[PDB]
């Protein structure tokens, strides 16, 4: 058996993450000051007699500065009061921000708040085109709509064309904020990534900045970064000691990029155990993917698939040596998870992730069968298989394992494929298919999403990519709707699903596979989040 020759780029990080020693004196100093700044900030939020516009701007600033996770109760109480008092008497700037903030927090504020800014025809008044802060906030708000918000149908196009027109003559840092927003809206960005940009490029350069908030944000970002580096060191050593880099050289070596993925799902310190469990799974399923896609023979992949279904160390001997390596690593990883969750009495929840992993591998094998047979399924059949091969049902399930508050009922809800999860999975599927179409096509993969779409509907690549873009837009509206109260589970368990969809948008920005090719997109993010501290 002569295998397909390896074409993946090596890890561009080497060992620079392998060893990190926290400076305990600096850490304790930061924490000590943060506690003080945190209280000053809490008192800013609980201050009586603030105007609506001032209250919304304070909350928005604290959220963009990445420090709102300290104030979830206070912020929720304030937005809840604003929701219930129903103040519809403001300018575009305040109205659009009110709408976005309430919607992002699950408060179903009516989109009729925008009627006064539109003409008889439902189109935004073009007289608003000279109000740059109104346009910017309308732009950001336009990305949080549901299927019930067609009054906002025109908002993205309207704000975009006029922000583009105004941008070159704006003062700084407003110009840079607008320019950034047009490339990456806030709602669909990875929170740490957007926070890092906001702190260093915008708020640090604002003449009006609050000094207490800016210092708080910098110390907190840098203190959390220390934790992330410890985690990544710990994960880098784990990966190094598995040595897939040499024993499975056909596979993508991307444990840092996998860590960036897990960091996108949640960054807070209470999810430290969850992040570390998650990155290990993302890493390991990546190995399995490359085995199906770029190395294993039809017969080998059949044995591997069957062994995964049986999930028994007795099955190893049915496998080629090189498959024994990953199979044992997989079984051991889940034994690790079980032991790690023992003292909290949560070991039994590991089986939910295992069953999702089995599902991914069955569908990998189907995809391989399709390839060998030269089968091009209809789109409905394609999706019934290819949705799971995104790994996103599996990653979402995995994200709950290290979350101490996740219960059987939460896993039960997730197991039924709720709409918000299905949407996030669909976004991953259609975005990846649009970006990897040409490549997979060159490699003879006739069952690619876009190809199935073209053959099924009898349309061009352009029309098919446009139809896939529509599916992604529909799915984002489903995600936004899925966040609205009353939620079927705690918001804490919805946000990881939302964040998975954000990571897709951020990683495949400009229609390129950033995970397989980290140099262009992921490398700057990893440097900003995990290498360079914010200068104070």
Binding positions for (2E,6E)-farnesyl diphosphate: 252, 289, 293, 429, 432
Q: Kindly report the number of other CB atoms within 10 A of residue 197's CB atom.
A: 18
Stretch(es) of the chain classified as CATH 1.50.10.130: 49-208
Q: Give strand pairing partners of 124.
A: 118
Provide the token pair at 247.
């024993």
Q: Where are the alpha helices (DSSP H) in 184-210?
A: 191-197
Stretch(es) of the chain classified as CATH 1.10.600.10: 5-48+209-535
Q: Which residue has the tokens 């990846």?
A: 432
Side-chain-side CA neighbours of residue 413 (13 Å) = 16
Binding positions for Mg(2+): 289, 293, 432-433, 436, 440
Question: What is the CATH architecture of 5-48+209-535?
Answer: Orthogonal Bundle (1.10)
Q: Which residue has the tokens 């943060």?
A: 34
> Which of 242, 430, 449, 221 lies closest to 328 in space, CA to CA?
242
Q: Give 279's contacts (C-beta < 8 A, 6+ positions apart).
A: 235, 255, 258, 259, 261, 262
DSSP 200: I
Q: Residues 295, 4: contact at Cβ < 8 Å?
A: yes
* Resolution reading in Å: 2.0
Provide the token pair at 381.
């059949």
d(CA 99, CA 101): 6
> Which of 136, 143, 65, 67 lies closest to 104 in space, CA to CA?
143
Q: How many residues does the chain have?
A: 536
d(CA 220, CA 203): 15
Question: What is the CATH architecture of 49-208?
Answer: Alpha/alpha barrel (1.50)
Q: Residues 425, 483: contact at Cβ < 8 Å?
A: no
**Expt. technique:** X-ray
Binding positions: 252, 289, 293, 429, 432-433, 436, 440
Q: Residues 141, 155: contact at Cβ < 8 Å?
A: yes
For the chain, first and last CA: distance in Å? 58
Provide the token pair at 83.
């929701």
Q: Where are the alpha helices (DSSP H) in 374-416?
A: 379-386, 392-401, 408-415
Q: Give 282's contacts (C-beta < 8 A, 6+ positions apart).
A: 258, 261, 262, 391, 395, 398
Among left, alpha and beta (phi > 0; psi -120 to 50; other), residue 490 is: beta
Q: Give 45's contacts (C-beta < 8 A, 6+ positions apart).
A: 58, 59, 62, 71, 74, 75, 78
The residue ranges of DSSP E strands in 268-397, in sequence order, are: none
Active-site residues, by number, are 252, 261, 389-391, 429, 432, 508, 513, 515
d(CA 491, CA 483): 7
């Amino acid at each position: 058996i002569v295998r397909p020759v390896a074409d993946f780029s090596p890890s561009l990080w080497g060992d620079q993450f392998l060893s990190f020693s926290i400076k305990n004196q600096v850490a304790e100093k930061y924490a000590k000051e943060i506690e003080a700044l945190k209280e000053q900030t809490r008192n800013m939020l609980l201050a009586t007699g603030m105007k609506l516009a001032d209250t919304l701007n304070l909350i928005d600033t604290i959220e963009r500065l990445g420090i709102s996770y300290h104030f979830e109760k206070e912020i929720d109480d304030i937005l809840d009061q604003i929701y219930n008092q129903n103040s519809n008497c403001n300018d575009l700037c305040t109205s659009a921000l009110q709408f976005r903030l309430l919607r992002q927090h699950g408060f179903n504020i009516s989109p009729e708040i925008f009627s006064k800014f539109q003409d008889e025809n439902g189109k935004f008044k073009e007289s608003l085109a000279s109000d740059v802060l109104g346009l910017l906030n309308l732009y950001e708000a336009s990305h949080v709509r549901t299927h019930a918000d067609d009054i906002l149908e025109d908002a993205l196009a309207f704000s975009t064309i006029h922000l583009e027109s105004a941008a070159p003559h704006l003062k700084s840092p407003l110009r840079e904020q607008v320019t950034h927003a047009l490339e990456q809206c806030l709602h669909k960005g990875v929170p740490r990534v957007e926070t890092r940009f906001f702190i260093s490029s915008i708020y640090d350069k604002e003449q009006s900045k609050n000094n207490v908030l800016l210092r708080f944000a910098k110390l907190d970002f840098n203190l959390l970064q220390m934790l992330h580096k410890q985690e990544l060191a710990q994960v880098s050593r784990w990966w190094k000691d598995l040595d897939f880099v040499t024993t499975l050289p056909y596979a993508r070596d991307r444990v840092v990029e996998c860590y960036f993925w897990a960091l996108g799902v949640y960054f807070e310190p209470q999810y430290s155990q969850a992040r570390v469990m998650l990155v290990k799974t993302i890493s390991m399923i990546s190995i399995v993917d490359d085995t199906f896609d770029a190395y294993g023979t039809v017969k080998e992949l059949e044995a591997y698939t069957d062994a995964i279904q049986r999930w028994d160390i007795n099955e190893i001997d049915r496998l080629p040596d090189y498959m024994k390596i990953s199979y044992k690593a997989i079984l051991d990883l889940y034994k690790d998870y079980e032991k790690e969750l023992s003292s909290a009495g949560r070991s039994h929840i590991v089986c939910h992730a295992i069953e999702r992993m089995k599902e991914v591998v069955r569908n990998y094998n189907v995809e391989s069968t399709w390839f060998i047979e030269g089968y091009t399924p209809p789109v409905s059949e394609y999706l019934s298989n290819a949705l799971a091969t995104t790994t996103y049902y599996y990653l979402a399930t995995t994200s709950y394992l290290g979350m101490k508050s996740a219960t059987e009922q939460d896993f039960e809800w997730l197991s039924k494929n709720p709409k918000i999860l299905e949407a996030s999975v669909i976004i991953c599927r259609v975005i990846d298919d649009t970006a990897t179409y040409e490549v997979e096509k060159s490699r003879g993969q006739i069952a690619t999403g876009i190809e199935c779409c073209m053959r099924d509907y009898g349309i061009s690549t352009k029309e098919a990519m446009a139809k896939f873009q529509n599916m992604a837009e529909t799915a984002w509206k489903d995600i936004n709707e899925g966040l609205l109260r009353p939620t079927p589970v705690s918001t804490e368990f919805l946000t990881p699903i939302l964040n998975l969809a954000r990571i897709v948008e951020v990683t495949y920005i400009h229609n390129l596979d950033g995970y397989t090719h980290p140099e262009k997109v992921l490398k700057p993010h990893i440097i900003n989040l995990l290498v360079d501290s914010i200068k104070i």
